[PDB]
Amino acid sequence: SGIALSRLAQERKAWRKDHPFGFVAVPTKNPDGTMNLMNWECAIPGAAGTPWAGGLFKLRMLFKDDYPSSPPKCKFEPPLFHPNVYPSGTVCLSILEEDKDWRPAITIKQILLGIQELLNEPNIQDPAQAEAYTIYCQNRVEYEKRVRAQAKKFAP
């Protein structure tokens, strides 16, 4: 898709020029070694001073041919303990749904910062996994203990 590819080239240029410290967002490669702009390997650092601190959380960003009409699918690899991350790793967030708050102008930087924000502030109305949601509701102290253990596990 020329439209998707043009926008993705724009995103890549902007990202490389200026991006938040500790974040990574890089296109992958096709079997023939050429660049695949439709599938990016990204990483989000845990925010300092939070239970996520010290962790580096890898996630894939997958674009459909009709991007930026549609949002990318964003999927933590491996899946994370968080109330709004499905067991598959897929992130549940309103800016990531075409029929909710996605807007075509939203940038890769804005997506990754939005997901970082989500990490430290779950949305309890729409849980995506039972376990992290249940613990977050029942015992915030235990919830944070689990988050800290996960951040240590994913220290770079």
Side-chain angles (χ1 to χ4, degrees):
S1 160
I3 294 165
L5 292 170
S6 178
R7 175 59 180 280
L8 289 161
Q10 174 181 290
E11 290 288 332
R12 178 175 182 259
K13 184 173 179 179
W15 178 266
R16 291 169 63 92
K17 179 178 186 176
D18 175 33
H19 71 257
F21 187 75
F23 287 72
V24 178
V26 183
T28 58
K29 299 182 176 188
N30 296 308
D32 72 349
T34 60
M35 180 177 56
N36 183 4
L37 285 166
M38 310 303 289
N39 179 333
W40 294 41
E41 283 166 3
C42 306
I44 297 173
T50 77
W52 299 80
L56 186 60
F57 307 99
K58 294 183 170 178
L59 78 161
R60 191 172 301 277
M61 194 171 292
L62 298 165
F63 298 91
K64 293 193 293 185
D65 285 350
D66 66 351
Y67 170 81
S69 186
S70 56
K73 172 165 52 168
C74 296
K75 196 163 184 291
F76 282 110
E77 299 179 338
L80 297 182
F81 177 89
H82 184 282
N84 307 113
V85 177
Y86 285 105
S88 68
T90 299
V91 174
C92 184
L93 183 61
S94 292
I95 60 163
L96 297 179
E97 292 182 40
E98 183 177 309
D99 289 330
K100 298 188 176 178
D101 296 334
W102 173 249
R103 297 175 284 102
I106 294 176
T107 65
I108 292 178
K109 185 190 300 179
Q110 289 171 326
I111 292 167
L112 293 175
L113 284 167
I115 297 172
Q116 190 193 44
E117 286 166 357
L118 177 66
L119 291 180
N120 194 44
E121 185 61 14
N123 301 120
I124 68 166
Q125 292 307 127
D126 48 84
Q129 61 163 265
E131 199 205 12
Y133 167 77
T134 300
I135 298 176
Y136 192 80
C137 289
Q138 289 177 348
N139 187 335
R140 287 283 292 273
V141 172
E142 179 67 11
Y143 175 80
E144 291 197 348
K145 176 181 189 180
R146 290 283 299 275
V147 169
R148 291 192 307 272
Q150 174 170 255
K152 184 172 186 177
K153 182 177 180 184
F154 296 116

